[PDB]
Design a protein around this nucleic acid. Sequence first.
DNA 1: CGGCATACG
DNA 2: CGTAT
DNA 3: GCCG
Length: 327
Amino acid sequence: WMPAYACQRPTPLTHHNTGLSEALEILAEAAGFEGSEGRLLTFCRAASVLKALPSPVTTLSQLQGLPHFGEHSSRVVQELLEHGVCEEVERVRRSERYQTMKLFTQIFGVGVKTADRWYREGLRTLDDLREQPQKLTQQQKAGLQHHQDLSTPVLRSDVDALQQVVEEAVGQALPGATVTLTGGFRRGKLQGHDVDFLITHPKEGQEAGLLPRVMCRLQDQGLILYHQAFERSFCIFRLPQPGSWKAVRVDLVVAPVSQFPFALLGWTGSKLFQRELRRFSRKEKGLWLNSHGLFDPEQKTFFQAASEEDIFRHLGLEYLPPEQRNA
DNA sequence: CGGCATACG
DNA sequence: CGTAT
DNA sequence: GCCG
Ligand SMILES: [Mn+2]
Ligand SMILES: [Mn+2]
Ligand SMILES: [Mn+2]
Ligand SMILES: [Mn+2]
Ligand SMILES: [Mn+2]
Ligand SMILES: [Mn+2]
Ligand code: NA
């Protein structure tokens, strides 16, 4: 009834088991803060299974036969169904370790390994980090300075204005080049932490050298608060606001049109969806998938794709629109 | 038990 | 090390 | 933590 891989089932943005999935995702996040990628993955997958169910789970027996539910995830759900709360989840929520690793890793430029080291050094607050700025990278200094704005959700309204701005600079850098909205907003989210754009050009090869030209023009318009040949740019944009402005994270990515379907697929996510899709491709089909292409290692050939639909067909999967990739 | 996605900056 | 989905 |  329920396939094992998230890429084999539709997952809508909103669903019927929100509280249960959020609890399991707390445990997934905490596992990640402790370097347990395997446990993170299982809890993520179990959470996603519930997102894909057609109705609420009300009794423990409804978990029987569901992939990725074993003793641990089942007990989490059991406690939530019986008591409305899971003691393990609540203990994580209020732990100093969890709250601080969450606070630190949310900083642009800070990963788990950096946050862990800072935690072991006794640091606990953002002001603790501001006191010793000589230990910060330029990227972390930017992430810390802009942290408050970057913690404010980006609205769909913000996205349209940013897209117009990016297209203006893209059109000057290379007439005919296109801008596609990707990431969470393409999956139908109404808010997000950042905005993701994919840029290409209909004439293979014309996109070479494009991203530096785009960035130079955005920077000349005074719109870049922070950025690093290249094909991915992780920026902080100055977004106009009523009588002011706010910092917003924007990712710009360039791909040649031959690779565009693969890059669109990868950059549209979700993160779990893409990991599961790549896992499925390799383990079930013997094909190697990334945001550049799909490789047959036996024939030593790349699949040509003209669309996302092509890629799902190549992999023997029913097509899923972006709004059903919210694994 | 081994595996857990796969890149770029 | 960071970043991305 | 769970699957095959
Ligand atoms: Mn009980
Ligand atoms: Mn995004
Ligand atoms: Mn992004
Ligand atoms: Mn490339
Ligand atoms: Mn093992
Ligand atoms: Mn993201
Ligand atoms: Na971070």
